[PDB]
Design an enzyme around this catalytic site. Structure first.
Site, PDB file in Angstrom:
ATOM      1  N   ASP A 264     -10.408   4.369  15.450  1.00  0.00           N
ATOM      2  CA  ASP A 264     -11.210   4.478  13.956  1.00  0.00           C
ATOM      3  C   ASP A 264     -11.330   3.063  13.484  1.00  0.00           C
ATOM      4  O   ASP A 264     -11.548   3.279  12.493  1.00  0.00           O
ATOM      5  CB  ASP A 264     -11.559   5.410  13.494  1.00  0.00           C
ATOM      6  CG  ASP A 264     -11.285   6.484  14.884  1.00  0.00           C
ATOM      7  OD1 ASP A 264     -10.331   7.147  15.563  1.00  0.00           O
ATOM      8  OD2 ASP A 264     -13.088   7.502  14.302  1.00  0.00           O
TER       9      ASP A 264
ATOM     10  N   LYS B 135       0.593  -1.075   0.307  1.00  0.00           N
ATOM     11  CA  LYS B 135       0.278  -0.237  -0.066  1.00  0.00           C
ATOM     12  C   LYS B 135       0.867   1.167   0.444  1.00  0.00           C
ATOM     13  O   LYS B 135       1.428   1.404   0.908  1.00  0.00           O
ATOM     14  CB  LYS B 135      -1.253   0.096   1.569  1.00  0.00           C
ATOM     15  CG  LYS B 135      -2.146   1.065   1.322  1.00  0.00           C
ATOM     16  CD  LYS B 135      -2.809   1.333   1.584  1.00  0.00           C
ATOM     17  CE  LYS B 135      -3.883   2.003   2.434  1.00  0.00           C
ATOM     18  NZ  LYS B 135      -5.870   2.123   3.301  1.00  0.00           N
TER      19      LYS B 135
END
Ligand SMILES: Nc1ncnc2c1ncn2[C@@H]1O[C@H](COP(=O)(O)OP(=O)(O)NP(=O)(O)O)[C@@H](O)[C@H]1O
Ligand SMILES: CC(C)c1ccccc1-c1nc(NCc2ccccn2)c2c(ccn2C)n1
Length: 317
Positions: free
Chosen positions: A241, A113
């Site tokens: 989160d 990524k």
């Protein structure tokens, strides 16, 4: 006038060059059994500068930086990945580009990524915390398995790359895909998303499809035990989160023809099979991601988030 076209992307080509170089350099440096404080602040930098000495697959000016090379080599070893396999997985054949800057290895064992300078800063903060955690649990976690971290420089333009073990299968394709937070608010896939072959579904989609997970109390008590201490670790770091990424492989639908005397060369470490007696025979791929580590091109108190998250995930079974 217009932009330049290439058969091979420069950034990716330098990246695969750099990984080759870095593993070659590492094979000549005995791995320490004990990591020291300085290893978490260490880097390898190489700058290439060729005048009038032209190559096809590679630019003439470029830099490669490896962050904390002894740390990530130690992580690979704890995650059961020999440097030679890592190198082969990443370079033997080129990687497949998926959707912005997100790559899977030809063998599908690894994910790569692109991330921000900001994210690299975050990685460094908790890297020693994470390594301690990986030692404690003997690499047995639902967290991401970070295998390497690098900065590629082409055109005087820095790309940051992060390598992770693929949470999804080395070959078994994923039919249904959820991101679950257990959020107080409602979470749902857009119309633009459900339009895709493999859309990222969410909390309401899971509930609205009355979706459950059938794995068997023994594999469930093994899962929730691990999930709890993983999430407790995230609380200690005041991280919030995050999601459970849940992939469903339907057995009956099976794989494409390119899956006689051949055994799987890799293990799917986040995979868990349908228990006997269940609406459909399936394999589940469950791991923990956030906005940083989501299988996608990068675009309230921790203890509450935690208690809430564990509530929602305990109910999918
Ligand atoms: N050892 C480190 N610990 C913590 N944060 C770091 C460390 N090294 C780099 N960073 C941060 O990670 C991001 C990427 O930094 P990077 O581009 O590697 O810069 P640099 O190491 O200062 N430059 P250079 O001397 O050319 O290699 C930035 O947010 C940096 O401040
Ligand atoms: C424990 C965490 C995986 C980690 C390991 C090593 C080194 C760093 C981190 C980290 N992970 C972030 N996010 C990615 C993430 C979070 C939760 C679950 C999955 N993936 C972070 C930070 C700081 C801010 N954020 C957003 N540190």
């Amino acid at each position: 006038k217009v932009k330049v076209f290439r058969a091979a992307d420069p950034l990716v080509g330098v990246f695969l060059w750099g990984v080759a170089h870095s593993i070659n350099e590492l094979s000549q440096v005995p791995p320490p059994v004990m990591l020291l404080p300085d290893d978490f602040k260490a880097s390898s930098k190489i700058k290439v500068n060729n005048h009038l000495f032209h190559r096809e697959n590679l630019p003439s000016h470029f830099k490669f930086k490896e962050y904390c090379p002894q740390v990530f080599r130690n992580l690979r070893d704890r995650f059961g990945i020999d440097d030679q396999d890592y190198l082969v997985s990443l370079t033997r054949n080129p990687p497949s580009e998926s959707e912005g800057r997100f790559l899977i290895s030809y063998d599908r064992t690894l994910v790569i990524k692109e991330v921000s300078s900001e994210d690299i800063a975050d990685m460094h903060s908790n890297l020693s915390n994470y390594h301690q955690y990986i030692v404690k649990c003997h690499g047995n976690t639902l967290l991401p398995q970070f295998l390497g971290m690098y900065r590629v420089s082409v055109d005087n333009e820095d790309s940051y790359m992060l390598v992770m073990r693929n949470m999804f299968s080395h070959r078994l394709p994923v039919h249904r895909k959820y991101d679950l937070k257990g959020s107080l608010v409602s979470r749902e896939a857009s119309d633009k998303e459900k339009v895709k072959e493999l859309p990222t579904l969410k909390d309401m989609d899971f509930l609205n499809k009355n979706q459950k997970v059938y794995i068997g109390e023994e594999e469930k008590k093994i899962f929730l035990e691990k999930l709890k201490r993983d999430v407790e670790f995230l609380v200690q770091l005041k991280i919030m989160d995050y999601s459970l990424l849940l992939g469903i492989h339907d057995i009956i639908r099976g794989s494409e023809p390119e899956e006689p005397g051949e055994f799987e060369s890799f293990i799917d470490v986040y995979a868990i099979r349908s228990a006997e007696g269940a609406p459909q025979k399936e394999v589940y791929f469950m791991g923990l991601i956030d906005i940083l580590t989501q299988y996608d091109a990068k675009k309230v108190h921790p203890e509450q988030y935690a208690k809430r998250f564990l509530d929602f995930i305990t109910n999918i079974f």
